[PDB]
Ligand SMILES: Nc1nc2c(ncn2[C@@H]2O[C@H](COP(=O)(O)OP(=O)(O)O)[C@@H](O)[C@H]2O)c(=O)[nH]1
Ligand SMILES: Cc1cc2nc(/C=C/c3cccnc3)sc2cc1C
Ligand SMILES: [Ca+2]
């Protein structure tokens with residue numbers, strides 16, 4: 001009975017610790033996934049704007065090849 | 068010298084325990100300060116049974132006060148006979164048990180139990196000849212139920228050859244604090260079946276009915292309920308605390324009352340429950356009446372294995388003997404025929420306060436199964452849907468332990484039904 005008393009209280013500790021472990025990992029996964037997604041969102045936005053620069057330079061270059 | 072160590076655990080256990088000490092201290096003539104101021108040497112002849120003699124001729128109860136929260140024990144220390152208790156014998160935590168058997172038995176209570184055992188050991192070591200242990204508690208809560216039975220388990224390990232008796236308050240939906248009371252009670256009963264010699268089953272439903280139907284109290288409080296318990300506990304311990312014809316310790320009393328190890332759950336009774344004194348026939352009639360039973364079980368639904376009856380006051384012992392022989396010979400169908408002379412009677416000259424004479428009933432009836440059946444119904448009603456189980460599994464318990472406790476009490480019930488049809 002004594003060793004059962006030990007098994008119960010250490011099962012309580014184990015479950016409480018696993019809950020904290022899972023929560024910490026799930027949160028770390030989400031904040032990391034979010035960081036990658038938001039950066040990629042802004043990376044794609046700036047790349048389009050940097051594409052407008054490439055197009056604008058070709059416009060001025062195309063006019064330059066008419067003079 | 069036949070010393071008894073008293074232990075009280077939890078809210079109910081301590082409030083009832085305090086009232087018990089409040090009552091017997093009055094009977095022995097001990098004031099709240101611990102000084103004796105009686106009027107008879109008979110009050111001191113067996114004073115050592117429940118009291119330790121202090122340095123300055125004071126009498127300090129051999130009591131140990133246990134709780135997981137300081138709330139109730141602060142109330143005791145601030146009570147009438149609060150200063151009479153040994154300060155070191157106040158063992159308490161801070162967390163509480165939250166009406167949870169698991170917290171009392173496995174987690175919170177486990178952290179405190181060794182501290183209690185040290186006090187128990189300290190009291191036991193200073194006993195010339197330890198007679199046994201005595202626990203007051205409820206089974207529906209967390210501390211008295213969970214830690215109470217854990218303490219019993221520990222005491223049986225350290226004192227395997229000592230008598231372990233309990234005054235256990237059974238939960239009831241009529242007088243309830245939480246819905247998990249049947250869970251806590253079922254878990255505790257399994258412990259009591261194996262680890263106690265005598266358990267006085269005090270049903271709060273019975274106590275409520277007595278206060279309402281008989282005592283004509285419209286709104287019974289716990290205080291009113293504990294008044295009945297206090298008076299019963301005084302009566303049960305009367306022959307142990309006072310000189311008389313009965314020369315027996317806890318063991319000898321257990322031997323004559325318990326024919327089967329597991330079947331040791333008694334139905335307490337008391338009479339009267341007024342200026343007009345009762346006659347001996349009236350005492351005997353009421354004493355066997357269901358309305359004076361405190362286990363909320365009808366004795367006519369079962370049979371008596373053994374019966375003990377204690378009369379207090381100056382009365383015709385011949386008339387008492389005749390009246391006891393009257394009830395038995397008028398209702399012989401309710402007493403088992405395979406145990407000759409199973410009804411024993413003792414008389415004490417000193418009556419309790421307020422009454423010129425009284426009577427206390429101790430019945431080992433098979434009708435007590437009605438109480439366990441009732442608890443088992445309430446248990447199964449929730450457990451079949453695994454309701455409120457998360458409170459317990461969160462403390463490390465498994466569903467299997469519940470299934471096992473449920474099965475052991477159904478076995479207990481079946482065991483009682485076995486001897487009812489004998
Ligand atoms: N007779 C009586 N029963 C009580 C008292 N206090 C609580 N109870 C019962 O005991 C159960 C609650 O257990 P409790 O002792 O309060 O919890 P604990 O402190 O963890 O042991 C409920 O079923 C209540 O009906 C009391 O003072 N007198
Ligand atoms: C036959 C008989 C039995 C009996 N048993 C008693 C129990 C006393 C007790 C007190 C405190 C704790 N545990 C048990 S009183 C009594 C009186 C008679 C006649
Ligand atoms: Ca702690």
Ligand SMILES: [Mg+2]
Nearest residue numbers: 078079208244
């Ligand atoms: Mg309570």
